[PDB]
């Protein structure tokens, strides 16, 4: 459409396609209104329910790096990490690293979960489905924490750690913390079905 808007001016949002029509609504990459130059924005989100569903996906992945106390409150470092990871994804796959981000989030969102329902007067955990927004929430969180701990006390630095996790989760291989936790949750829920 009208898409002469590239994040960091150099990674075209155009020609990115989401596989899940389920997460199509909740991934902010498609509409001409969801394109942004930078994954930093002083958005008045969380002021209302579901308003985060229209947060830019890159921004809503950016907010999840800045965690564990020493890193709380500093988005400039987070967006710097995002920039370096995003360019290194390109420097390996030579394909739209935006599409890499999106496809990884598709392929690492738990589709079923076992929680603690009670019925008939008796409470015991059972399997339930996962609404797509919480799909995305867990995807973001669970891809990110893998990079955090896999780069902790490690000379490999966070940009390349998170790049490894993204490239390999999007590729689909079970070599990432993310997709390893995915099928673990999936199998606990399948057993408890």
């Amino acid at each position: 459409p009208g898409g002469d808007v590239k994040l960091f001016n150099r990674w075209t949002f155009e020609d990115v396609q989401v596989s899940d029509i389920s997460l199509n609504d909740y991934l902010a990459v498609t509409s001409m209104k969801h394109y942004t130059f930078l994954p930093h924005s002083a958005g008045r989100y969380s002021a209302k329910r579901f308003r985060k569903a229209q947060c830019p996906i890159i921004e809503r992945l950016t907010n999840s790096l800045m965690m564990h106390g020493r890193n709380n409150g500093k988005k400039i470092m987070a967006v710097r990490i995002i920039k370096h990871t995003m360019e290194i994804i390109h420097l390996l796959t030579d394909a739209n690293p935006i599409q890499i981000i999106v496809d990884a989030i598709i392929n690492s969102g738990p589709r079923e979960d076992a929680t603690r329902i009670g019925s008939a007067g008796v409470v015991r955990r059972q399997a339930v489905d996962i609404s797509p927004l919480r799909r995305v929430n867990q995807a973001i969180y669970l891809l990110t924490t893998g990079a955090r701990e896999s780069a902790f006390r490690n000379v490999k630095t966070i940009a390349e750690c998170l790049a490894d996790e993204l490239i390999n989760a999007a590729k689909g291989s079970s070599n990432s913390y993310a997709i390893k936790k995915k099928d673990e949750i999936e199998r606990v829920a399948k057993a408890n079905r």
Binding site: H84, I88, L91, L92, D94, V155, T157, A159, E160
Partner: protein, 77 residues
């Protein structure tokens, strides 16, 4: 990797990264970063952040130096 403690051992300053190891390490995708490959060529940093300087005057690859000294790689063009 013990890669700044091993900086003066003559193997590194003689043949290892003098386009014998990090000539083929970039070649996996034809461009694989020096900071990414800090562990694919397991050799860690500052015996590596200096050999990147050596390879830039040796004129074999392009350079991108930025915030946390995130530096990169490109094999031949």
């Amino acid at each position: 990797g013990k890669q700044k403690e091993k900086v003066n051992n003559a193997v590194l300053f003689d043949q290892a990264t003098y386009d014998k190891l990090l000539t083929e390490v970039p070649k996996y995708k034809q461009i694989t970063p020096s900071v990414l490959s800090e562990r694919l060529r397991i050799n860690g940093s500052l015996a590596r952040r200096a050999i990147k300087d050596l390879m830039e005057r040796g004129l074999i690859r392009m350079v991108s130096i930025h915030s946390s000294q995130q530096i990169f790689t490109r094999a031949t063009n």
